[PDB]
Amino acid sequence: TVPSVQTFGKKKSATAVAHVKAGKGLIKVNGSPITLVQPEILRFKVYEPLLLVGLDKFANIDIRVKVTGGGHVSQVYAIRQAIAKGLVAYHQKFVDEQSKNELKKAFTSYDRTLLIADSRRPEPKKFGGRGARSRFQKSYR
Amino acid sequence: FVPVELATTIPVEIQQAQQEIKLFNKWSFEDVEVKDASLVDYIQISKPIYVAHTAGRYANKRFRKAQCPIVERLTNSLMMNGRNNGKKLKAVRIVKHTLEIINVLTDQNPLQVVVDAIINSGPREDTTRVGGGGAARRQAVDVSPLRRVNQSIALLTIGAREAAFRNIKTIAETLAEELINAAKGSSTSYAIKKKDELERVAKSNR
Amino acid sequence: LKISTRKTPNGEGSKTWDTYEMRIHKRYIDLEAPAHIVKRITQITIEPGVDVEVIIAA
Amino acid sequence: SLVVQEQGSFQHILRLLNTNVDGNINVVYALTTIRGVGRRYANLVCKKADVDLHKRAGELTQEELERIVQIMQNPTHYKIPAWFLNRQKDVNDGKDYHSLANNLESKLRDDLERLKKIRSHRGIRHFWGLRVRGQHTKTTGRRRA
């Protein structure tokens, strides 16, 4: 069997997992194409890495992303991240270091996570307030 | 332009030179004309973001707020008042609609129009409650660029909000109209008027 | 195991909460092994605190 | 979807079941103006009649209106069971009724009178002018009469 690389994508709590193989030109979210994802507006967010790198760099690829958690936007972001990460992983494994560098450069003209996983995770909701930082409502008299 | 052969179905537009030139969801992020001298890294432009929806850190440094795409900032500003806190997708959609409206009416690249509006609304001279004992004394203070830009954006959004409060006019159309008014032509938009009034007030005071 | 409790025993005072928690560790092992000797083995060595439970099935 | 422009055939503002029915409200929502008639049930009535809901208030021909009225006043015959109508089971006949326009209020009044006669708690409350259905008058109901 042909070697294939596994990658993931994280945002908030949403977990994407991409599987990059050698093949014809697959790009799949769960069991569907990237031409769907969900919100129609945010279809470009998941499509963006492909646009950046060049669609020809996919003429020998197979991509499948299993996504669980988050909401919708977060999920999309995670998928995008996974795809970017998948590509970079593939380059690391099969292609060349200069190519990897180029890819990184292309990504880092934005750096919307892509190659680097996001920090910024939910802060615990404290007592004496409805929010994490938000205090209750001081009554006085 | 240059179809890439895949097993998965990809639209024609994507296949075309959108891979080659990375400008917006089918709009020109070029042109690049700021009417005032410099003003760059305060009004962002340059970086050709596809859709005005980026999750990043733009409060964690002093001026890093500038590196937000102007469209994105507009969307964020629109995202306001109870019924719409969060729901950035909606805001993005509205912005897209606004852009479309701009394209339809008086042609041009809408981004440039937006930029013009931002420039020509925002105030040079502003008022602060300095006090003089806490009383009604306000020295005329000139405004910093980034802050001014932000203020202009806010007032633009405010105008749209005002328009929409019980009306047939959907937010986006109204916003577009007011933006156009702000840019040049009539200057009968709310935001611009407000700004001018503020400027006048500043002038009559020191 | 979280037990959220107001620290105040009377209620008069500010709203102070304490979540008294007990983290409980499971950890299991699967043995594909013989009979009497295995049983003998899976009985000895006891540390204070930890509870060992051996089930059945042949 | 209708491409039909329509000439001078529809007459706005109609006098149906004594209470005035206003113009260009969407049939169901035109009928809602009448007391006893309410949204979902109006819609159901319309469906039973077999008139398309996506029409004007003045649009309705007389026959259709008549049919609707019949459906409203005599509900049981046109497949409308219990979880449906106003006075289910009822206290006076045993049969259930979908009371309308100037009937429901009368019924309510009658009920109140009966309560007063038989000095029940609810009745007493009504007589007073006080809140009945489990409310604390420490804050509730400071608008008065």
Next chain:
Amino acid sequence: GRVRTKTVKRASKALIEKYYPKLTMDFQTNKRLCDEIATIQSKRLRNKIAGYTTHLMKRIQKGPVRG
């Protein structure tokens, strides 16, 4: 905010005094040395100590230092 404790500083000083042979500029080697030589209960503290030792060394290789 990063102004460090007294104890950490004292430890660093002691290390400088007693182990100027050994310890250079390489933070990771220095860390290891600290772990070996000084008996500290926590990793963060050790790291801090190492950092301060490095700083002190840097100061030294620019002229004699007070204290």
Next chain:
Amino acid sequence: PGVSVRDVPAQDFINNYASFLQRQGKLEVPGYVDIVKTSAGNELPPQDSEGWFYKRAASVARHIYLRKQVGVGKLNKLYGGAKNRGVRPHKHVDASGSINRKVLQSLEKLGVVEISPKGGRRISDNGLRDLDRIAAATLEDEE
């Protein structure tokens, strides 16, 4: 080269399926079509009189195709939403429990949805074929 259900857009597909169902004779409708609100967590019944239950059936079929072990309860949970309690904050209330069951029964009668000996309902081979056909039709409509 071909088509499957997952790779074709949601709403369009569903509407196509509904249309197909309408065209077809067999459906076994209840005696209470558009008399129920489809959810007890809903305020007003569906619009445009004819159909809608067809649409729901189609959606159910799609869901079944997607998963493996889906019962009535799960389907009910899937549908409905927030019930306007009015003055009180809206809790999530499931759909009308019997309607989904009826839909499933109808599907069974048609021969598209069967049962698995684990619990719940799964897709039949004929059903799968039908779904594929619908997908193909949708694709044709698109391009």
Next chain:
Amino acid sequence: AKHAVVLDQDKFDRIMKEAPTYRYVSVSVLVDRFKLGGSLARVALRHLENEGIIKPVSKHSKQAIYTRAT
């Protein structure tokens, strides 16, 4: 709006002759320039879009973005 929810023949004619020259066509626009006010405006717009007359820009509902043929 003082009623004005009628697909009147004269009104239709007016719409036909006033939707050109103006670049932007919407329900809101129609309401503004005094013809139809509300729900039936949408219907009118839909039935103007069968073949030609006004070209679509919008791929989205609720808000309509339409430009007349040049």
Next chain:
Amino acid sequence: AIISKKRKLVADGVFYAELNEFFTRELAEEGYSGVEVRVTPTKTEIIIRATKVQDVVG
């Protein structure tokens, strides 16, 4: 017990607490300090700490 592991553990803790309380109440002159509960599947062992051992014994 047959009850859930977590619940069982909680119960054991409670029992321990109870035991401690009892010892504090009863063994005043006996000079009580602390208790430990060791559980083997057949035998339950409690180790009591004290200063006047003879008294504790009887």
Next chain:
Amino acid sequence: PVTLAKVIKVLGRTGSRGGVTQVRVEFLEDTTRTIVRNVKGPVREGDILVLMESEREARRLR
């Protein structure tokens, strides 16, 4: 009338409420002038600052 001057150095921050910056403005049209100006909001070095006011200047804000 329109004028604009680049900022170069900040002369601290003054105000009863605070926030309002005292800046040293240098004119890009003739660099011979470095004036003490009142600026409201976030401002660094090397920024083009439009001025509706031509000549009037104040230091402390009270």
Next chain:
RNA sequence: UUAAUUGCGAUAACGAACGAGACCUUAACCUACUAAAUAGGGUUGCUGGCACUUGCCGGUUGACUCUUCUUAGAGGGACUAUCGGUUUCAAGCCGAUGGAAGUUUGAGGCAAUAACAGGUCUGUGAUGCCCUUAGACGUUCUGGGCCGCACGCGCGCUACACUGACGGAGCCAGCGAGUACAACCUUGGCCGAGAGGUCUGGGUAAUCUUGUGAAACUCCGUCGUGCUGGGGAUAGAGCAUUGUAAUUAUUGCUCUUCAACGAGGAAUUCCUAGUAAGCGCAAGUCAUCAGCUUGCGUUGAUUACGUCCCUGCCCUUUGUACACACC
């Protein structure tokens, strides 16, 4: 200087001790290690469907192989690192690079001395003392009552609509919690139009409920400036459910009833990033009931990065006819 009696340093003080910090707890990073039908893959069987020449999407406890995601355990990781300048060039700080991350990395949890005449004997078998002690203030049973209403405040919720509402149809979460010496969380299949019944099984736990298919959102509609399909209070009438017991609607569900309410005076609270707000959910209470709290998680802004003007606080000096200490 620093968030800091945090440092550096000047030094009738020197050496200290609390406190802070460190420390724990988690949240982030570990394609590193140990590992895994109670966590997911991978290939291939076994089949199902459409292309058919390989294929795509699945189902199935078939093997076998691992472990990136899910779990944990040992560990590692950042220490302000690297420069750039500024500062008696010491202490440090702001900017840039690299980094999962440079605000003490975010948030906690423990919190010193000294008190307050703060709070509670209505947590207790923690009690001093006074009282009542047999028609008892003990005790339990029956029934009310704390839920009464001309009013006045305090929390919170729902709204005042188009970014709406109302229909469809997309579809995605994390904390939990749940059976024995009782009557739990409840799936799946038939009843009913809802609620909720009902025979069955699974699950006294990563397995089953539950992927908690959660909302808000997303797309196609319908309605369209109207106290109007916005608002759902108040009223009727009826069907269930919990309970020995629902009237003073327990709650739930169906119905009809459609008021005040056009963004809110003077006032004032809360908040500087996964934060504010929107939106749910679970848990606590619980037989039944959440508008409540307590914890999660979706959606995710705007504007500061500062000053002491108001409100406090900290130390230093100063003046006090004040120590019940400016009340």
Next chain:
RNA sequence: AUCUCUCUCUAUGCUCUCUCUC
């Protein structure tokens, strides 16, 4: 020799008290 330069009303308040053993 380098300061620079800010600003006004605001009245009153009645409820104790405490040591040890060297």
